Curated annotation (Swiss-Prot), chain B:
Belongs to the secretoglobin family. It comes from Felis catus (Cat). This is Major allergen I polypeptide chain 2. Heterotetramer composed of two non-covalently linked disulfide-linked heterodimer of chains 1 and 2. One of its GO terms (cellular component) is extracellular space. The lineage of its organism: Eukaryota, Metazoa, Chordata, Craniata, Vertebrata. Keywords: Allergen, Disulfide bond, Glycoprotein, Secreted, Signal. Its main location: secreted. The long form is preferentially expressed in the salivary gland, while the short form is preferentially expressed in the skin. It is found in: Secreted. The chain holds residues 18 to 91 of 109 of the full protein. The gene is CH2. Glycans are attached at residue 104.
Length: 146, 145
């Protein structure tokens, strides 16, 4: 089934919002100081590491995910998104690659997504409380559960 | 709001089921080989590390979570549960302790929950787990609407 719009919004802001716009949006779901602190580290990293072209390619890849049969035609909410998102957040390069292949990622798209994964990995955020909590919280919100 | 029953059931099975029963249930939500491999390692670790007494103390603590105003009276689904769960899954002992105090954990209850957290930390499993994937999948499922 299609992704919850609140989830798509969170990823869009993550990529295209200002740091404040993103972190404040996170704070609406989970206002733990550590979560907000980690969210800002991550967001500052993606802004610095990704060019405009990189962001454009991330967005086109995400559009491929949201429109994939492996997202839409499945019984539950957009399963391939969650596979990709959690591979990114926890630095699983193997599963990320496999999952990007399932949605016909271009090389520039793959490069863009790997930069986001690098921001989790290089800042030591794999074993930190962040997007497992935030993404679970958005996805299970009353907004999404309709 | 009260936790989704399917989430409560998953956690109960994690603690009290056989490894095969727990992994087969995880597979119904997310059948990725890495997820099932990790689920089994984690399950075998908790079964070996936790005494019957530890498991009882964990079940008692979860009950405190499920009945807490910080779970039930909130606008969204059992927020304190998710805080605890993700502090466990990521080996954040500070955040785990802060959350446990909120639900009036006893010392043996803290001890039991730390054993679960230790099983995530053990042998670098925290570096592997796709924490959030299974839990997001159960929590956002049609059954949880
Ligand atoms: Ca940039
Ligand atoms: Ca390029
Ligand atoms: Ca993690
Ligand atoms: Ca035992």
């Amino acid at each position: 089934m299609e992704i919850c719009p609140a989830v798509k919004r969170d990823v869009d802001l993550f990529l295209t919002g200002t740091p404040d716009e993103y972190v404040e949006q996170v704070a609406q779901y989970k206002a733990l100081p550590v979560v907000l602190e980690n969210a800002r580290i991550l967001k500052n990293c993606v802004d610095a590491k990704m060019t405009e072209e990189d962001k454009e390619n991330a967005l086109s890849l995400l559009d491929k995910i949201y429109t994939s049969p492996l997202c839409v035609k499945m019984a539950e909410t957009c399963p391939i998104f969650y596979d990709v998102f959690f591979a990114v957040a926890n630095g699983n390069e193997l599963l990320l690659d496999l999952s990007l292949t399932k949605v016909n990622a271009t090389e520039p798209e793959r490069t863009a997504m790997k930069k986001i994964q690098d921001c989790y990995v290089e800042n030591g955020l794999i074993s930190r409380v962040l997007d497992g909590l935030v993404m679970t919280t958005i996805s299970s919100s009353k907004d999404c559960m309709g």
